[PDB]
Design a protein around this ligand. Structure first.
Ligand SMILES: CC(C)Cn1c(=O)n(C)c(=O)c2nc[nH]c21
Ligand SMILES: CC(C)Cn1c(=O)n(C)c(=O)c2nc[nH]c21
Ligand SMILES: [Cl-]
Ligand SMILES: [Mg+2]
Ligand SMILES: [Mg+2]
Ligand SMILES: [Zn+2]
Ligand SMILES: [Zn+2]
Lengths: 326, 326
């Protein structure tokens, strides 16, 4: 009568293009079909002569190399790449960007957290891990993500880039690296600044302007959870906090600095979200809206709502804990 | 390491181009992935804007509409379509045919036995079945295969021709009808003569000449299982005879006429093959070799070897019956 799960119904194909898409409904293989579809639908399979079979193997290998972390997992990977896919449609990015650029944006989005250990850079550096030693305390996680990405692509079976002349590869690889390395939150302010600076007299044919825009785009998708509808956004926060508490417990247990923002004893869902939405998320999207007006209605709207929802929740949190003493 | 069965190895993708391909090793879902690969690899998806998912849904629906016959089943249609794909490479057919021609050839190969009951035309006509009545004793099975083919494509989610302009559709539809109908073995000698007549002075840009070549090609692929290595060829013969025996049993049991060549009592495997190879297969391929010289060494040769092998088995079979029969 009807078809297997991995064949996407036309309703799904439609919803995939929109930020309201419910990421929680799907299972690993379903998600892999979606990612696969994105590559065809954006015409990347066509313009880069990607063998459609290689692509499936690549996607599967990528899935294997994500870990069973509360937040930094394949579902998140999928979530980021889906957001990226929405923005290509919403902002008509194919008008402003070459196909190469779109290829870079999508691949980097899929790859950006490969083999995340579930503990942040500060953990690596303070605990003097293999990765910190290997990368000399310079964005060890992001370097490793990027290294794993190209290890997968160096494998013949998984090499979606096999039909691209060497000079194209070099350009793609350089783009991915920049993008994946830019997801390190430590660099946030720096990148924001450079962007804001160039944002004063922006030129779509100045390569350094474009590079920064791509950087901002991936950063946007990276932390775009709070942009999604409340039902979808809310569980992600719990997962993130779960991961943070796991780290601080270890850090406490081994005698390493604990970040207050990760401390089980100091942190509440609302206080965590409020400053983050208000001071990191909102300003970042505000700046993007100057280039793409539609972003306000689609991205800023629900962020404002989330801000208000969490501010109100804090009032509640405060009133309740006040009650329990005086 | 561990890729699912339905992700085809690069070795598999490779062997798919040769007529030595072992059709028996594969589960339905793998056979589906192979047929999918063919449409991409030949540029059919590209040149006809076939929605990659619709292709998959279409293939699945086609699968659903094949029956569980000993011979006339989905593995057979896969086998036929795989042989056709080999022809395209072996004989460099893309230098001779439009992409529209290829699409007709592939699609008709896939659709050519849809919903086969396991009883041939002679059975339908003599038993006055519903199909024989519907089609007035004119190639009733083949007509039925077609109708199902187009009933499948009439479903929007299965319609791999959605983005083909109406003229193109009419042209494809006409081609497919001609080819599927040419698979009725009652017409074999008629078609051979027409082709041989054209063969005296063959014109690659005469439409009548090409229509006939395409008819011969589908006919070749249809009975081509006999051209594969012994290990692959022989089981098919047992399957066909199972179907034949099932029918002749019914015909005896219902007082209908029985064809000698389908008779449990009159037929040996060896004697059936020798006859078929000598008076149907070899002459057909011999005349095709005059247009495509490479066919001799890769079809005709295995056929000669086969004919010799079965001649040996016959000597041994005869000796066995010389011990029974009282
Ligand atoms: C406060 C900030 C440095 C830590 N931080 C973060 O890095 N990401 C990605 C979040 O989604 C987030 N939410 C609260 N804090 C967060
Ligand atoms: C009965 C059999 C020896 C003849 N025969 C046949 O008629 N068709 C259609 C085949 O595909 C086939 N394959 C092997 N023999 C075959
Ligand atoms: Cl506001
Ligand atoms: Mg990260
Ligand atoms: Mg038939
Ligand atoms: Zn991330
Ligand atoms: Zn057949």
């Amino acid at each position: 009568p009807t078809y297997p799960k991995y064949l996407l119904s036309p309703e799904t194909i439609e919803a995939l293009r929109k930020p309201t898409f419910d990421v929680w409904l799907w299972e690993p293989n379903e998600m892999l079909s979606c990612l696969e579809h994105m590559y065809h639908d954006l015409g990347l399979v066509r313009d880069f002569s990607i063998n459609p079979v290689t692509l499936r193997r690549w996607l599967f290998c990528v899935h294997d190399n994500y870990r069973n972390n509360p937040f930094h997992n394949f579902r998140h990977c999928f979530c980021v790449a889906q957001m990226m896919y929405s923005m290509v449609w919403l902002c008509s990015l194919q008008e402003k960007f070459s196909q190469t650029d779109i290829l870079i944006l999508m691949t980097a989005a899929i790859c950006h957290d490969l083999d995340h250990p579930g503990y942040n850079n500060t953990y690596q550096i303070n605990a003097r891990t293999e990765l910190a030693v290997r990368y000399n305390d310079i964005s060890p996680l992001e370097n490793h993500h990027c290294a794993v990405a190209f290890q997968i692509l160096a494998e013949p079976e998984c090499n979606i880039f096999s039909n691209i002349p060497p000079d194209g590869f070099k350009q793609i690889r350089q783009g991915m690296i920049t993008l994946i390395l830019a997801t390190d939150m430590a660099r946030h302010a720096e990148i924001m600044d450079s962007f804001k600076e160039k944002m004063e007299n922006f030129d779509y044919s100045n390569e350094e302007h474009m590079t920064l825009l791509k950087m901002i785009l991936i950063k946007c998708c990276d932390i775009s959870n709070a942009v999604r509808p409340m039902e979808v956004a809310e569980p992600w926060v719990d997962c993130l906090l779960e991961e943070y508490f796991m780290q601080s417990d270890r850090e406490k247990s081994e005698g390493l600095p604990v970040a207050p923002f990760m401390d089980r004893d100091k942190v509440t869902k609302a206080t965590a979200q409020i400053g983050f939405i208000k001071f990191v998320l909102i300003p970042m999207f505000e700046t993007v809206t100057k280039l793409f007006p539609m972003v306000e209605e689609i991205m800023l709207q629900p962020l404002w709502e989330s801000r208000d929802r969490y501010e109100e929740l804090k009032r509640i949190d405060d009133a309740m804990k006040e009650l329990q003493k005086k």
